[PDB]
Symmetry: D3
Subunit: 266 residues, 6 copies
């Protein structure tokens, strides 16, 4: 597992975006062999999207043969609502890069047969073979996407009933109105994430410090889902300074020395 200890969110997004760019450029994707990218939404990846767009505009990367899969979507919310994850993803990324519509995959929160929607999503991933790089964030309690603590590490794409803490912490978008916040969401599973070739988790804010600690220094346990990334063949935590509060000083010093050459320029 790699830990990239940075100072600010802007540095974290530049690092993550540069990592994505370097994986895409080394892979050399084509129409028949696309690079498959898993993506999250929310405030945490914002500086990464901003930096990815920048690099695209600077001519350093093309998304023409990049296929994407998003982690989740609200159930029963119209796709064109500005707070849908569809809307977030276009406004913050797809509106500014050269990816074709047929390459973009998002869960249909309005599908008539929800279990069918979830089944097809998993099938579509398998039609390409695998996600090469899945970027995500982590909950304060170590959970992933809308999966709950003690989720099966093999769980799959499925509908979830959001937690009060989550409606609550999202009611702001439903202009600060915790009654309109959709009750349910579609989310990829933990197994869906773990099947990716590489997993890169963005960790921002002292509210994630216990999760960072559970991921990096704690032992493997299903109650802190993020800890099971220790068993993943290729996992990376990219973090800012406030998120490191619960780590030991020597842990932070170890990774700061091991990755020093890699965190220049960004």
């Amino acid at each position: 597992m790699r830990l990239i200890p940075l100072t600010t969110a802007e540095q974290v997004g530049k690092w993550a975006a540069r990592h994505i760019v370097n994986r895409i450029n080394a892979f050399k994707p084509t129409a028949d062999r696309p690079f498959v990218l898993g993506l999250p939404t929310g405030g945490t990846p914002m500086t990464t999207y901003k930096a990815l767009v920048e690099m695209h505009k600077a001519g350093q990367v093309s998304f023409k043969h990049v296929v994407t899969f998003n982690m989740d979507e609200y159930v029963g919310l119209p796709k064109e609502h500005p707070e849908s994850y569809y809307s977030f993803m276009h406004r913050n990324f797809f509106d500014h890069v050269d990816i074709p519509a047929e390459n973009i995959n998002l869960l249909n929160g309005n599908a008539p047969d929800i279990d069918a929607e979830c089944r097809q999503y998993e099938e579509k991933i398998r039609s390409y073979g695998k996600i090469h790089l899945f970027m995500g964030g982590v909950g304060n309690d170590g959970h992933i996407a809308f999966n709950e603590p003690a989720s099966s590490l093999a769980s799959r794409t499925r509908i979830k009933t959001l937690t009060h803490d989550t409606r609550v912490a999202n009611s702001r978008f439903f202009d600060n109105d915790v009654n309109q916040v959709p009750k349910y969401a579609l989310t990829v599973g933990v197994g869906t994430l773990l099947d990716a070739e590489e997993v890169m988790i963005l960790v921002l804010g002292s509210q994630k410090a216990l999760a960072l600690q559970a991921a990096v220094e704690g032992c493997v346990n299903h109650m802190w889902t993020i800890s099971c990334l220790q068993l993943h063949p290729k996992a990376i935590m990219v973090c800012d300074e406030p998120s490191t509060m619960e780590l030991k000083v020597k842990t932070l010093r170890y990774f700061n020395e091991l990755e020093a050459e890699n965190i220049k320029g960004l």
Copy 2:
């Protein structure tokens, strides 16, 4: 992993038996595609067998195309001894349901070539492909079947030398005579159990409280074998009230809310 927090043993058996019934009825087994059920013996599954029998008699389930594999058997004990696991299983379950003899698999504790017996058992499981649901209990120290603490998670069906604590705690059946209790037993391995599609562990009694804690809140470690079910794709702990003594109040409250809809009726 699911935790089903119930109050009494009778509720635990009804829940477990209803789960088994629902898996069988959704699977729709046939002569050429049987439902494969792994089973334990002892006091812990008694209320489950009693409830399964009841449901069978009420016409809610048929075992005509259900194939079963038991976890273990005493070595050198005549099969018709009333304390053999063969005898337990017929008296508490098979005597009352419609399963055919050819569908019942039990280890032959009287086989002339013990290693061969153990090899054939594993081969028979593989001939059907997989166990769809393996029901078991857990030792006070978290062990499974007759496997010992720090058993390999890939261990397989094999002969074991029973522990004093086990002969001791079983001498009662050998009418309370710890000298007749067979010295050895045949048992499936931890790998045998983990290869099942779903694992459901019955947890009864405050003597199992540390094991329950190690399974649900502790981290993964081979000394408490039950903790490695955290890594299993589909594991369920079904427990009574006294078994919950070592859990945190919030852990019990979390699962009691998450599974509330599912523990009605039983």
Copy 3:
């Protein structure tokens, strides 16, 4: 996992060497079906090599159809330097047994294309299929070979920059001159080791006591790489008395009783 608690290094080497011999003799290797043995260097396996040689000379084992893979080699050191791992392995083992040159595999620390060298090594292992028994030691911090703490459990053969603690602790061979000690080494990966059928770790000295504890009593975590052997299908720790300092008395007593029959004669 097995723990073989012995008293002295000489007993540990006899036990390990007898284990190796028994695996080879039960396997019955041939020209077209060799026994594949993974091997380490350093002070820790010395009494094992001495005992293996002895058994060979006593006519108890032949290495004619044994293929070996060593864990590592210094980069840029001439192979005939007496402190190369090539030189160690010939002087302590291959010079005294009947293994053919074509059966010996060592990393070429002088290869012109290092990444290519590392790729070919993994390919050669796969050409035979698998390592049947990989013998190794463990770092004071639980690491394996030249892999670092928090290495991926799927990492593979690759070049590493040695740690000061390692150059320091090896400068003695570069006649106690920490300036000549090569800066880099080639090492198999953790995945390389875990892919072996059986892993046997030699544990000598109270400086390994925390690692032994993390391997046997602690939980699974990537910071102590050796702890992930708890998840390996067939792992054995062979240890001397001073290495047991951080274990609980009952843990040492448990394994001392479970393996009693097996540690006679040696």
Copy 4:
């Protein structure tokens, strides 16, 4: 140490108020031998004051010969500001009972010589001899009054610079304006509290659950000041249901059985 596990805040205040009443009535205070009561402010003791007033009005207790000492006061806030602790204490308690002004002791946050004020307060306590019962609450991080984590257990009455978390969590009274909230406060010390004959801590809300756990099940350590009450000769924790979230089920069950006879009626 006693733990009184109750369900609601109203029950906690009735229990605490009944305890206070029973200590006062058994002591039989007089003009020359007053009962000395230490008191806190804030939302936590509100139901206790409400119940104390009730009991007073029902003729069950008199405060005529009760002397009180409050834990703290804001520095530079006019005493008649409605949010001063003076104002809180009169409005919620002294306005409704028969205690004489000369018996009421509060820190003068407007004293010209602050260190002198703090010295005199300690001297006044010692002039009576000792506090017989000190009632308080506990911070989310286990701290007491305005003392900080890792305060000396012998610290004494003194001025403190409030924490952002505290100004923040109190800005609501300074009509939700975190700029007017006084920067400093006077507070009794941890030694001041520990010198009382009996200490009764009110614990309300799941935000206090980690503190409750540190007080009752954790070990003694100065970072969670409340844990050092384990060393106090006569300490009582009175808590509501949500505060018990981090305790083990058996801990809550133990105290619920030990104190059962004592939590009836309230």
Copy 5:
């Protein structure tokens, strides 16, 4: 704190008895300056009493000016019942040594005013000044005498309601009849014990292993009362081999080396 690691109960009693003898002989007690000895009952001190008697008979010690205080007594049991603690103490010790009746102090479980009895006992100890050496055992959960877990460290002599586990584990004397076992007992308090000049705890049996661990390696906490002996000026644990099961090997090795000179002869 000293830990005296011995092998058998007989060695523990000889060591403890020799310690007692050496304290008495160095103190040189007289009519007006007696040696004050606190004593327990039960199976744990039996080999100590047997060895003390032996030493007395060998002329190595006199109890003529030794005053004793016992830890506890059953309430409502006639003193001459053979299972009273009075009866135990005479039959196992006082019947065989030269101590005068006026020097023997035992709680009167038949006193008409129980609280008065308990008050007088504490007063009698204080009339002599202090207990020079208090010998005791420890409960499986670390408790002392009949004090419960989380007892105040300043608690005093008082009546207690016995626990089921205790009636249960003592019903054997009430010829194995858990209905006659007195419901209540008088016991010295934890403060009573801690006020002694030196405290020597006898630890026998693997059932005490967790308590031994909490006393010696764990941190100070009131839930394991025995752990607070770490704060006592002069505490000694005398233990047999099975009691050491939960200690680390290096802990046992440390004390075995530090006390080596002192455990010869016994």
Copy 6:
């Protein structure tokens, strides 16, 4: 407890020396009311002595009415040996300041009656009343002076048999000859240290990191003697950067903010 987190040893000595100076100047010592200072030897306080001397020479402090007590001395070493603690203390401090011989107290390692020497030392401290400030260091295992782990917190001045690790780590002064290093030493006790009014521990080097952690973040336990300073009324840890390796980042950040105003200038 205060933690003063500094970067280098030179800053630690300046801080400590300034603290000492400020305590002395605020106390205003006289012939009949001296300031009593407890002192250690070794490499750890060297920069403090150097800075104290400097301040003395700058006219900021006088030792005319300062009385000192040193922690320890070698047994049987001639006082004028350059490696005696007498010799260390004169060469590094007393040779450069204005303290009178009658004010200097050091243990006489050559006393004819060792127990008498140790008794008189304690008596001399009590003749002045108390040590106002005791400065010391801490062992890698948290021990104090020559006291061992699990020493009584009330232990007193006494002779000790040095540990191999200590002779070993000091043989360098006995020009790197571990055979001349005295076998025994006189040392103040833990009680002697804890009786001081204020205790200031100098913590230098990553080898002290576990001890620092046990002092500041761990719980109270006698195996890490330094942890019991959490119970001391007025304790200060002054540390350099490498010593902070085992602390959590937030712990170091907390104290760095709380003491910021106090670590300027030095």
